[PDB]
Amino acid sequence: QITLKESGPTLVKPTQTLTLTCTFSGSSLSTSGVGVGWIRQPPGKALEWLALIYWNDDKRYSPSLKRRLTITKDTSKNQVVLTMTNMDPVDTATYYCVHRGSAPYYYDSSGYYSTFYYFDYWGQGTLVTVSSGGGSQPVLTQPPSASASLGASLSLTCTLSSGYNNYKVDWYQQRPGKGPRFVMRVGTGGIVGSKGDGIPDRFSVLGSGLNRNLTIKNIQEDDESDYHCGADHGSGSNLDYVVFGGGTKLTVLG
Amino acid sequence: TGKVTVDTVCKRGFLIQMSGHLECKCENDLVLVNEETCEEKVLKCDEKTVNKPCGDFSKCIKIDGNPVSYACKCNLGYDMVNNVCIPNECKQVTCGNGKCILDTSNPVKTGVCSCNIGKVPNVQDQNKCSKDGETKCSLKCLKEQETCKAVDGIYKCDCKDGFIIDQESSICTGTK
Ligand SMILES: *[C@@H]1O[C@H](CO)[C@@H](O)[C@H](O)[C@H]1NC(C)=O
């Protein structure tokens, strides 16, 4: 486990700068980790990746919000700091500190020693309220909502746009009132690597063509949550930007 | 075969002993693919060279990103420091006349110092390799005219005094 604790002001007035701080524990300098970043979510809307800072002091920013974002780190204090200028009411969102690490090594279909980098640990996030006063990229399509009975089985779908049939997507489970957590990565075949910590065996993934499905079996009460799919665009540790779907809200009837 | 002992056969390598452990050292240009095995190093990690060794306890690995890529990554539980894979728990361990290794007697992965022959960990010096102490050679050097010898701080099986490595058969033979 890696614990990420967000701290910072929760009420901001329009045009002001927001400065969030994240304190990480369990990692020092590439001890099963490559970076620490920030992802935000307007209430009831899609996740949005903001920034990332690597342990080699490299930085990445959202292409559309780059002019407003600055990220720094003070390793002596185990802190990364995000700075976002010219805040607006639409920037009202829960802001999540995230850790980007590497999946435990696994052997894939062809027997190839493999790994990948993903947002493997999420902070609980902080809700920042702002008072009153993108071409040629993947597009992830998720159905707005779904429903299932207790003990039933269900497949949530996440479809890639044309020309992205080789891209792998990650599924995230956000139980209500709690922050997202990594579930599984899936590409054109089956599960890529292993499922995240705390993910029960009732979850599985299967992809074909542009479709990336997350199946939940023997649906219990705690599966009621938002299920988000994302896709990382970058070769290696590298991360040009991150796309997310609209998210699917699963209601468990009964 | 799990841990390296005095009975281990180092494939294309040979046993060396320090104050606190034994390990296989590779021949000529070879690198350790595991604790017992040495094989040729690959220079570039590619789709063709995946799973192959590219350094001591380091293998070419496929990164399942978008796009897929390839890199030379240290084995699980290790990290690249000074262009060599060392256990994660030894990242900031300075042993001095020795090297940091994982303590086999501690069930939680912990870094400890294994010292050059003649030295042992020093509690008065942050457990560094600055205490004079004997380490009896445990190697079973059973090959022709070979005995245990301390060479550059490690124990190793080498030719007895008066013998040299025959240039044809690589066995110890009388100098002449
Ligand atoms: C995903 O689920 C939908 C709906 O059940 C199904 O029609 C589709 O075939 C599934 N795709 C894959 C790749 O399993």
Numbering used by the authors:
A (entry chain H): 1 to 133, 150 to 270
B (entry chain A): -1 to 174
Reported in the publication:
Pfs25 is a leading antigen for a malaria transmission-blocking vaccine and shows moderate transmission-blocking activity and induction of rapidly decreasing antibody titers in clinical trials.
The majority of this buried surface area (BSA) was contributed by the heavy chain (645 Å2) compared to the light chain (267 Å2). The heavy chain formed six hydrogen bonds and one salt bridge, while the light chain formed five hydrogen bonds. The majority of Pfs25 polymorphisms lie within Site 1, while Site 4 and Site 5 are unaffected by common polymorphisms.
